Amino acid sequence: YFQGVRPAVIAATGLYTPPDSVSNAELVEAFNTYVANFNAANKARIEAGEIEPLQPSSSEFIEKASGIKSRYVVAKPGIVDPDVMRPIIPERSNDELSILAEMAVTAAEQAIERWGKPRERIGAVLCACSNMQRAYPAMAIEVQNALGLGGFAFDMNVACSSATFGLKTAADFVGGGSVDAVLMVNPEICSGHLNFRDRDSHFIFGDVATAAIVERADDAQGGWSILGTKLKTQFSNNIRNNAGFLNRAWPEGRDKADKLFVQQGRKVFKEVVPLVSEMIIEHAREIGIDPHGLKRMWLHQANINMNEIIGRKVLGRDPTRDENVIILDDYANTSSAGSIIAFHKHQDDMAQGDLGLICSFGAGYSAGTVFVQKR
Template identity: 30%
Template sequence: MVLRATIAGCGGYLPAQRLSNDELAALKGLETSDAWIRERTGIGYRHFAAAEETASDLGAAAAREALARAGADAAEVDAILVATSTPDSGFPATAVRIQAKLGITRGFAFDMSAACTGFIYALAVADSLIRVGQARSVLVIGTEVYSRILDWTDRSTCVLFGDGAGAVLLRAEEGGGTNADRGILSCHLHSDGRFGDILHIEGGAGSTGGPGLLRMAGREVFRHAVTKLAAVVDEALDANGLGHEDVRWLVPHQANLRIIEAMGRKLHLPPERVVVTVDRHANTSAASIPLALAEACGDGRIRPGDLAVLEAIGGGLTWGASIVRF
């Protein structure tokens, strides 16, 4: 028998302010249109945090929903892992802020920084903690307030992102050690720092004294995304003795509809078995996969026994995939 990290509950939170493409263009004085944005990205709407809302506020709200859907009490949580590129502060960690907001006074909490791949990285670490017995109940949260780091004079990037948070509660359960087990079967992580400058946030506390704005070379990121994501998904399936025909759901990072559709075709999945939220949420970075999970589990699409592939690529470059059976 082996310990598996099973997904007991998923939760999500989107700020109240919701802007269409045309509303965003009018508000920010952008020379763009709904048709231009939809054609290139698939995005129609995004949510922005209120002035008083922080990443920890959004993350705590998503965590509460995940706990409620799992029928769990915050007191059972052993650890909180938060993936974010827009933390409340340099320290303490946003995870610790969320720990306090949930009223948890035991266990441990820390942040992880891997940009849009952050949730996959955090899921991998949480899975390892459960496998070795360090924790039995772990909250994994992706939370972002990208509206704070966008350059509103650059229409090629500022229309792509939104704010939000998603969370999953992982619980330890015994499995037989086969690919028929429930829970996370494996996670596969990669990075290549040679391409760090094609998607990054300018500066930081250790260089310029504080973070600047997001910069992206969109065509370069797109070129790397399709090839690297296809490779890591095949790597993950091969590691578990699985094929494309075994996959019930693709739950991808929600960056661009073209990339999502390309990955669906790669796995030979019909569109209705690819979870898409980018049209309504835009790119919420580390929050996008758990937000998509919260929706697809909440509306009953993802059912017990279903096998799902989670995958993402982000600044670093970082990329990774996880195979999960619900």
């Protein structure tokens, strides 16, 4: 006898949105006060030529650069204080659920409720996101325990593509029969690793958690068939953050700007757009899908201008907003979670049989495609 590979579905999704938002106007007001304060405080070093003066930001600059209008944050006060310019997040006892696991648990509970099946049915938890709150014990195991789940759990990180890589992984796990269902969580406190003092990036990151339940198709009721997945990585330093455990072996570097998100945005725009467009069209052809026939695309949620170009190349025409979803206006860039927020929030109106594409892309470089069909 041979065990056959089981096709998979996305059976449910969940979303946790933090209650507090920072509008571009609020972000820019604090940033510009910071700029003025900094330039005055450092005027002698600036005039000596030791450092460049800082430049003010504007809401028009942000909206033109990215389409972002606001972002949600877990901890607002420090982000809008020119003397702080970062989250203030006091540590919790080991006895308490961590802030990052708590977000994952809330999104997962929504997915579990929608799914409606006994949670004992979940055999793996994947915590797939751009930054774990600690190395060990794994976030996914903390989440597994808080949800009362059996089985196994682990953390995986490919930054902006963690949710599409996580869906692929989940599909292979249920495909091989070792589990009947997999819970993926994508908790993102991106405000925790953004440099709010950097004009080139201070508007980019926001916070959220998403979740998805993947199960084999022969047991699923409704949901979305996973028609196929494709994953690609190609090393680049154009999106990088050097913070991590070996900084303790060089504490003199710990407060350098490279210990937060650094993006060379012009290069990312030039290189990632054709990488992704080509990958989508190649993958569609491999699996016999006409990319021109897609009903909806849920692309990565970082830069509307990149999505416009990728979407146009995939569809062969200027995509409508309905068919090329944008949630980065409200959420800004949430790294791994963005394409999943778009999918979760913008799918109810489609017809049985409609084809969609979940596609993530960003740091690594990484990119992932998941073609789906409404059941």
